[PDB]
Amino acid sequence: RVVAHMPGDIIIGALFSVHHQPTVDKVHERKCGAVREQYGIQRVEAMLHTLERINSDPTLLPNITLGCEIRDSCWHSAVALEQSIEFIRDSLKKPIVGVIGPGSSSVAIQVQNLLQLFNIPQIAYSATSMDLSDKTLFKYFMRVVPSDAQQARAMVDIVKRYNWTYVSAVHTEGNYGESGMEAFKDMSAKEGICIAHSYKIYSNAGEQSFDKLLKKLTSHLPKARVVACFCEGMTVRGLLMAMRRLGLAGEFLLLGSDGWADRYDVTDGYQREAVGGITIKLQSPDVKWFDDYYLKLRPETNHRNPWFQEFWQHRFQCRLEGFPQENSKYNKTCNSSLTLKTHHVQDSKMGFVINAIYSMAYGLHNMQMSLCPGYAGLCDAMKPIDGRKLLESLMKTNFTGVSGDTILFDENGDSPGRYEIMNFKEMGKDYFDYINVGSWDNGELKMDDDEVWSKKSNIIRSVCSEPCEKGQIKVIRKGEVSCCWTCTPCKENEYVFDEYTCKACQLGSWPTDDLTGCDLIPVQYLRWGDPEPIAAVVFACLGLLATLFVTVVFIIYRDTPVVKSSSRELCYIILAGICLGYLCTFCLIAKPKQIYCYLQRIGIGLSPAMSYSALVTKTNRIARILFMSACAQLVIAFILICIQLGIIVALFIMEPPDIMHDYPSIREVYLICNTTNLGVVTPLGYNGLLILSCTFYAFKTRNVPANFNEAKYIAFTMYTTCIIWLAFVPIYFGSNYKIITMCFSVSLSATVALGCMFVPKVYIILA
């Protein structure tokens, strides 16, 4: 082979792909193919001129002359891996200190696995694999270009900015697409972004495969209107060609990496279906001072580049007469007026090639400054140059590049990313072009929203499920994507706990209007203003007036013959019973409390006993005439009263008094005291016997004219008492109006008893 030398004191090695890689037939015999234009001569000339310029600089590396050795790589593993052997021989002729290259991202791994055994640092300018960031295996590798995990960050930032949350996924097969898509998925899963379904395809498959791809991506509209493509430059062309035939154009929004960034050869002839796509590029401004040097070169005055003459002949398709490398293949002869300005195109990677050399030079300068202080040249303590301190000098380099940007390496030897953002939209009648609409600068996304969309309302939307609403909980099924839910309402009984669940609050409570917390329903019970309680009260007042008049009459005229005929003490007992019958409505109708309920359950069982005991003993004595002392009768009446009171006390002991809350319905809550069925039924059963005996005896002795026909009135009264007790059961145990009916029943029975027994007596004594 041929190697390009340049003398000096410190030697640098470079591997540049000047020719095409050998075909499969000549892999074992090499024989590289055709010469390259962009990658072949421009890089070699740039390195030579950069070294000349850095030597002419008196500020950097004073009195030290740097050299170089440039070798071919042919974009093939074998050739580079042989030239590396040739380098490491001379290392063991000054030794090589560092290597710049190679271009490929898979040759570099095989060259590193060889160069790290002999402690040689390596810097690459176009290798962007994600496997090269592991410093356990690749300890001597550094690069000035962003990794493949920086595009997956800009893509996530762009998606996050525009509020997209349900997208597709396409990627080619290989290390590039697979690693990029893995990074994209890992970064997007942390920002609440979900993928419909990830796909996979070659870059040269058949039309049937592309049609099936379209049919499988069409089965998600209109839920996933954005496609996240991390594919190469031909998968996009295949997708556009497939879209053309099915008539699906003007519907999708393809978001792609820099495989399809600014290449016109991807959308030629298919500009109608690619409108709207957003792509990211790699920022790289041109280098001004390289053109003023590259164009002045002439074949007759270029001797340090052995590849120059064949390059000239290939480019101009002619033959150079009188030259050491004349070729007989070309019949035409070159003219003396030929020049290189004709269709001159600058290389698209000319910045990193210079930045790598500058980084290595700065590392050497720092090592010399920190190792040979106070001296200008090669001090005795730095001969020869060891490759273990240079690796630590290089990692801490930090300077400014050719374009005013900052160059620095992190702990992994990587570099920060800087990307542009383009947009393919129609300019006019049959005219399409890319235009810059933003940039990404290591965390700061600066994008012009006005230019991308003509109107705000025209923004494409892609969301799976609409958000919930006023009082709408989230219900999610099993096996589905986390961002495809359903909104359902809680019932009126239960409020909403959080975004995910309802919650049912305890009885007696009710959710508020905001559905944030159940509040307590105020207790509701009877009211004085209702006509029924006031009617009961006025009835009771009339009854008290009547009984007061009757007792006043009897007290005033206690010596009358009528009073002498009857029994005074028994009449007083009956009057007291009637008064206590009247005076239970005030206790009953009031708001329930501690002792009020006890008084109401005591009076209802006491009042129907004291009067009826005396009345039954009187009627029993009268029937016996047809133990005659009044003291015995009073003792018997008091004994029966005591028995009734003992029964009442036993009922009290069985169930102690208490206040109770009623829950008839969810909406309303009442307030009724402790009142069971037993404590009411038992006194009724006990007092039924007395009235039954009274009725029997009154029927037996209903035809005696004693005491102005007293027996007739005594027999006629009982009918009402018995019929009232009878009617008191059904409607008491058949509705929710217990208080009013049990307040009217006792009063009505007492008033009929008082009006059918004593009214004739007072009427007769009056006149």
Contacting residues toward ligand YKU, per CB under 6 A: 577-578, 581, 604, 607-608, 611, 684, 687-688, 691-692, 721, 725, 728, 742, 745-746, 749-750, 753
To the nearest whole angstrom, how small is the minimum distance from the Cβ of residue 411 to a second copy? 25
Q: Which does 687 bind (CB under 5 to 8 A by kind): a second copy, ligand YKU, none?
A: ligand YKU
- Please say whether the dihedral angle defined by the alpha carbons of residues 516, 522, 523 and 529, taken in this order, is positive or negative: negative
Q: Which does 313 bind (CB under 5 to 8 A by kind): ligand YKU, a second copy, none?
A: none
Q: Which does 92 bind (CB under 5 to 8 A by kind): a second copy, ligand YKU, none?
A: a second copy
CA angle, 147 as apex, 142 and 149 as ends, to 5°? 145
CA separation (Å) from 281 to 184, 268, 352, 428? 17, 19, 15, 24
- Round to whole Å and give the CA distance between 361 and 50: 11
To the nearest whole angstrom, how small is the minimum distance from the Cβ of residue 750 to ligand YKU? 4
To the nearest whole angstrom, how small is the minimum distance from the Cβ of residue 675 to ligand YKU? 13
Scanning 626-677, the segments in alpha helix (DSSP H) are 630-654
To the nearest whole angstrom, how small is the minimum distance from the Cβ of residue 634 to ligand YKU? 19
Using the minimum distance from each CB to a second copy, give the nearer residue, 81 or 487. 81
Using the minimum distance from each CB to ligand YKU, give the nearer residue, 250 or 688. 688
To the nearest whole angstrom, how small is the minimum distance from the Cβ of residue 2 to a second copy? 17
How does DSSP assign 166-193, residue by residue? EEEEB-BSSHHHHHHHHHHHHHHGGGT-
To the nearest whole angstrom, how small is the minimum distance from the Cβ of residue 383 to a second copy? 12
Contact status, residue 144 vs residue 125, Cβ threshold 8 Å = yes
CA separation (Å) from 19 to 44, 70, 75, 495? 13, 14, 8, 76
Interhelix angle for 678-700 vs 706-732, to 10°? 150
- Round to whole Å and give the CA distance between 104 and 112: 12
Using the minimum distance from each CB to a second copy, give the nearer residue, 85 or 731. 85
Q: Which does 82 bind (CB under 5 to 8 A by kind): ligand YKU, a second copy, none?
A: a second copy
- Round to whole Å and give the CA distance between 442 and 154: 9
Q: Which does 413 bind (CB under 5 to 8 A by kind): ligand YKU, a second copy, none?
A: none
DSSP structure class, residue 295: T
Q: Which does 18 bind (CB under 5 to 8 A by kind): a second copy, ligand YKU, none?
A: none
Using the minimum distance from each CB to a second copy, give the nearer residue, 89 or 139. 89
- Round to whole Å and give the CA distance between 443 and 458: 28
Rg (CA), the chain: 56
Using the minimum distance from each CB to ligand YKU, give the nearer residue, 244 or 738. 738
Using the minimum distance from each CB to ligand YKU, give the nearer residue, 95 or 605. 605
CA separation (Å) from 467 to 14, 463, 464? 59, 10, 10
Q: Which does 607 bind (CB under 5 to 8 A by kind): a second copy, ligand YKU, none?
A: ligand YKU
To the nearest whole angstrom, how small is the minimum distance from the Cβ of residue 691 to ligand YKU? 5
The SS3 of residue 484 is coil
Using the minimum distance from each CB to ligand YKU, give the nearer residue, 611 or 701. 611
To the nearest whole angstrom, how small is the minimum distance from the Cβ of residue 530 to ligand YKU? 21
Using the minimum distance from each CB to ligand YKU, give the nearer residue, 246 or 681. 681
Q: Which does 89 bind (CB under 5 to 8 A by kind): a second copy, ligand YKU, none?
A: a second copy
CA angle, 740 as apex, 575 and 722 as ends, to 5°? 50
Using the minimum distance from each CB to ligand YKU, give the nearer residue, 560 or 693. 693
Compute, in degrees rounded to 10, the torsion defined by CA atoms 129, 134, 140, 142: 50
Q: Partners of 502 in the beta sheet?
A: 496
Q: Which does 88 bind (CB under 5 to 8 A by kind): ligand YKU, a second copy, none?
A: a second copy
Using the minimum distance from each CB to a second copy, give the nearer residue, 113 or 198. 113
Q: Which amino acid is at 318?
A: C
- Round to whole Å and give the CA distance between 589 and 583: 11
| Nearest alpha-carbon partner for 130 in 33, 230, 215, 221 | 230
Phi, psi of 229 (to 5 degrees): -90, 125
After which residues do gaps appear in the chain, with C to N over 2.5 Å? Answer: 92, 626
To the nearest whole angstrom, how small is the minimum distance from the Cβ of residue 109 to a second copy? 11
Using the minimum distance from each CB to ligand YKU, give the nearer residue, 150 or 749. 749
- Round to whole Å and give the CA distance between 28 and 36: 22
To the nearest whole angstrom, how small is the minimum distance from the Cβ of residue 27 to a second copy? 12
Q: Partners of 96 in the beta sheet?
A: 11
Matching residue, tokens 């024989």: 31
- Please say whether the dihedral angle defined by the alpha carbons of residues 572, 575, 579 and 581, taken in this order, is positive or negative: positive
To the nearest whole angstrom, how small is the minimum distance from the Cβ of residue 497 to ligand YKU? 50
Residue closest to ligand YKU (Cβ): 725
Annotation: binding site:
39, 105, 126-128, 176, 258, 349
β-pair type (406-408, 278-282): unpaired
Q: Which does 691 bind (CB under 5 to 8 A by kind): a second copy, ligand YKU, none?
A: ligand YKU
- Round to whole Å and give the CA distance between 70 and 47: 9
Footprint of a second copy (CB under 8 A): 81-82, 85, 88-89, 92, 110, 113-114, 117-118
Using the minimum distance from each CB to a second copy, give the nearer residue, 303 or 388. 388
Q: Which does 85 bind (CB under 5 to 8 A by kind): a second copy, ligand YKU, none?
A: a second copy
- Round to whole Å and give the CA distance between 241 and 234: 10
Using the minimum distance from each CB to a second copy, give the nearer residue, 102 or 605. 102
Q: Which does 2 bind (CB under 5 to 8 A by kind): ligand YKU, a second copy, none?
A: none
Annotation: binding site for L-glutamate:
39, 105, 126-128, 176, 258, 349
Residue 763 host element (H or E):
helix 759-766
How does DSSP assign 71-132, residue by residue? EE-TT-HHHHHHHHHHHHHHH--PPEEEEE--SSTTHHHHHHHHHGGGT--EEESS---SGG
To the nearest whole angstrom, how small is the minimum distance from the Cβ of residue 492 to ligand YKU? 40
DSSP structure class, residue 320: -
Using the minimum distance from each CB to ligand YKU, give the nearer residue, 397 or 687. 687
To the nearest whole angstrom, how small is the minimum distance from the Cβ of residue 717 to ligand YKU? 10
- Round to whole Å and give the CA distance between 709 and 728: 30
To the nearest whole angstrom, how small is the minimum distance from the Cβ of residue 524 to ligand YKU? 26
Helix, strand, coil abundance in the chain, percent, nearest 5 = 45, 15, 40
Q: Which does 110 bind (CB under 5 to 8 A by kind): ligand YKU, a second copy, none?
A: a second copy
Interhelix angle for 568-582 vs 630-654, to 10°? 30
